[model samples]
Target: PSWPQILGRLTDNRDLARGQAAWAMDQIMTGNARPAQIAAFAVAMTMKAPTADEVGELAGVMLSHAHPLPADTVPDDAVDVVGTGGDGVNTVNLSTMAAIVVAAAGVPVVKHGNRAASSLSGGADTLEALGVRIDLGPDLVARSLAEVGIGFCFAPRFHPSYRHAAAVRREIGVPTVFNLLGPLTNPARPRAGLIGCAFADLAEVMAGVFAARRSSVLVVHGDDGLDELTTTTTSTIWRVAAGSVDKLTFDPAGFGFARAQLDQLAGGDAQANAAAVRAVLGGARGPVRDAVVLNAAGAIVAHAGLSSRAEWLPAWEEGLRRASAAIDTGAAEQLLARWVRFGRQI
Candidate 1:
């Protein structure tokens, strides 16, 4: 597609030019379109600014080609936790660990993830570091959900089409439209989500896009630029559904957490990142670990639509405690160990 021809149709802003670019880029990302086209289209769209409609169209395309797990694969009620990792923030996978904590609270969690892009450790990397195989088949993922109340949908496995644009994306060497599409393409298609966007501005855009796609979601971004609620900054949130939009600001200190320095949340490397997750899951009671738990607790409430955090936090805390105990007692460890041992049979 020529830049002028593409740009002419997309300049209207109201015509979903940004969305068309977004959808075109998604097609490119999932291997449905040509990489050169994707590159040109993405660059153009970025220059023009994406519209809500354009983003929605892109999300629609992604959800369609992405693997479709049976609804039964997820429990009747389930929550998905994810983040657009290009935030350039190097925090451990707090959202991934939050899934386990929520599951420990008796809520089913279907976590969708990929390998590290901008971050040192993506969710799958962290899980692998802990001895859990990150490449289980769809049926096995379903079984894991049934057995553990927590399931992982590795992004590449579900979105094999991405191979088409993979080379181009890798060569571009910078964050692109594809960076924002991952969370929208959850193959399991869970009913609810807690998505962390790198910028607060995207909270509304992404939340509106999800609502258009028919989902219940809590979209969050820390003012300091982290995707999730960070003790280091005032967290801005956008809650969306069929009929309403609620916005709120949250501070970690208000919840009794010490203010976090950006360095405190930095992931030294994959090993260090994995260790931080371990410490949190092992119930180490300190600011970082506690902050992770609080984030997970918020996710649980967001997914379950529980009455209030005041009402659900204690149970959420206990769930983290139990998950930590399970890890300590070697129960969680053994489960992951067995997954490593037997999962490769395929």
Candidate 2:
């Protein structure tokens, strides 16, 4: 599709929106689109407000060009816990810590992420700080998943096709539909996932996309504007599974946690964020620990198929207990130890 055709379809809000968006993304990924054209496409998408289906189409195209993890080595129950990091809240590596908690509970995790995009420390940065290798090849990552039940795929390595747009995206320097596409393009293509969206308006739209794929995903947006579930205010959750979508509200008190201040979740550079992760995973208590357990519990519930609030609440509570115990009993720490050693040995 020509740039003018794509722009015309997007601005008119026509039925060709999804097709045009997908075509534009293909051009961007393959280096067929000029930097100026890519910037215009991105800006126009942001201004027009992409629909869930449109974003889903673009994500599908991006994933088609990505190098996926070897399917034979990944377990059917593997799950990804990630967030679209343009929230600008700069919280601790909540999802990274939560991924450890989930793996500690016996669920395989293939965490797909990148370095800091808009935050102080991203998943790869925090994992690197914790002494885990972030640049492992696909085979090593697969081996890590099989041996340690956890793996991390740095985005730039697996999604080489995205290089075409990287320069333009950097030049643009703002959130676009690309921000929304990142979480949806996990290379592992896990059966279940927990994704945090920066805005509430994106929660249901993204959920709709997952539902169309018949995949299980929980999309959350905090009322206080953080990406991960917040302890300060109720968060909105969109549950997608088996071609169905549901919406729910999340409250910390209901999960046995008190309301926490947003400031308590502040994060700094990689070293500082790494220290915070270590503290939380080492049985330290307070809002940080509470937040990790809450997010991890959600991942557990989604992966385990605990559907209703009735089912999810009790399961998440049990998950929370086990996650906290994983830290206090040295199990979570042991998992991290094993992962670091394994990464080096490989």
Candidate 3:
């Protein structure tokens, strides 16, 4: 693969075939491309607005270079709850808490995330604040998932392949395709996912990537500018299965809940969000609980893989009931305690 040819193609505003993208990615990952060539590839692709198919191809090659979790660590039926994390909503770690609820609701979950970047706090921050080890090795992550029904994948630990390009990414000092590809690079290899993409247009972009992976996925965006589903406003979802994408919407009123203000869900640093996670799981009810439950409900529906609203609406209701109960019955709280215990025992 000639770096000149691929870079020239992107600069000419032409699309790259999956094979071409794969070849380019191999060059970048292997440090075969010059720094100028790597930065050019990122800038050119961003300017051209790379397609989901192209991003998916890049991601497929990237994942092949990741340190894979043990095969059984994340089962084929397991689901991941993740967000792209650039929405700037400053809300609590909704997806992290929801992963516990999802697991407590009898679904297997492996949460892959990072610390704060674009938001107030992130999954890794809040979980570590809650006393669960966020840096578990591959086998322990597998054990945690197998025994507790929930596990965590810290992004930095799993992707040593990003090493060479990571330095150039920082030097460029701008968001690039690398930023968008993190949520798609989970080493867990989940067969199902409920991802919260920061922007609406990017939801379908991310969905197309999962479609290529043959994974059941729902890429969501809060129309009010949240990456996760919101009680503040209706959210949009692009569901992908069978290699096609379907758009769906979720409103608080439709779920029999009152609309919430985004401020009502405000969070501070990792420590602040950790306390919020304890409160939400502790069964205190309000906009916070409603928002968390709503986030978890989105995961359940996506995890269930019901293709249409007709099939999904009823399941959504049931998911709401189950998610709410997972908190109310002290089950979610207990799992949080168990995660902490396992973290200590290991």
Candidate 4:
């Protein structure tokens, strides 16, 4: 497709916007589009704001070009827990910790993440500080999941085509469609996922995208303006399963957690954040630990096929209890050590 025609179509919100956007992404990924052209397309998409079908199509294009992991690499029940990472809260990597907790609670996890774009420490950064290798190849990654029940797919390694847009996105210096698309393009392509969106409005839109793809997914946005679930405020949750979407509101109190301040969860550099992760997994009691438990509960419910906030509450409570036990009983810590050892094997 001609870039000018595609750009015009997107600007007018024509019926062809979906296909045009996918074509533009293809051009960007294949190095056929100029940097200025890529920047213009990103800015235009942000200004026009993508429809659900557009977002779904863009994601499909991204996945079509990614280095896909083998189907048998991850267990069928495995789920990915990831966030869009532009919330600006800069809190410790809650989703990363939650993935570990969920794995310790006996569910397989394929966690996808990247380095810090807007925070002092991203998931991969914290994991590296914690002595877990972040550069494992696909074979080692699969082994990590099979042996440790948790595997981490560092984004750039799995989505090399993303490099084509990286420079332009950095020059633009604002979040574009790429930020929203990252969590949806996991190499493992796990059947189930819990995705955290930085904006509440994006939650429902993303739910539509997941539903369009017939994915078992949950998209969450904290009312307090964080991407992940917040203990301080209600979370808007959009659950999409079997091509149907359901909306629900989640409060920490229902899961036995008191309200917490954002400051209490704030994190510093990778070293500080890594220390905090160790503390939480070591059963250190605090608001951060409670936050991890709350998020992990959501992951457990999503993977277990539970529906409705009411149903999620009881199961979440049980999940939280189990996660706490895994921490205090030292099982979670042991699992992390095992994962680090496997990383060395790579």
Best candidate per lDDT, number? 3
Candidate 4, overall lDDT?
0.83
Clashing pairs in 2: none
Q: What is the lDDT of candidate 1?
A: 0.69
Instruction: Mark the regions of model 3 whose C-alpha exceeds 4 Å error after superposition.
Output: 170-173, 306-310
Q: Per-candidate TM vs. native?
A: 0.84, 0.95, 0.94, 0.95
Candidate 1 lDDT, tens digit per residue, 1-346?
4445565665544344344555565556545566667676655555566555777677676667777776567765678889887788778787877676666666778889888887778888888887676887788888777776777899889888776665666778775555567787788888677788885545677777777766667788878888876778788877765545678776656556777788777775667877887776665766676656667766765665433343334644553465445545645434444445555553
Residue range with the least summed lDDT across 10 consecutive positions in model 1:
304-313
In model 1, which runs have C-alpha deviations exceeding 4 angstroms? 1-4, 11-14, 17-32, 306-346
Query: For model 4, how does the per-residue alpha-carbon lDDT over 30-131 read when each residue is reduced to its tens digit?
Result: 889899899888777767776787778778888898877766788877888998888988798999998998899888999998999889999999999998
Overall lDDT per candidate, in order of appearance: 0.69, 0.84, 0.84, 0.83
Lowest lDDT block of 10, candidate 2? 304-313
> Worst ten-residue run, lDDT, model 3?
306-315
- In candidate 4, residue 262 scores what lDDT? 93
Which residue ranges in model 2 land beyond 4 Å of their true spot?
A: 15-18, 306-310
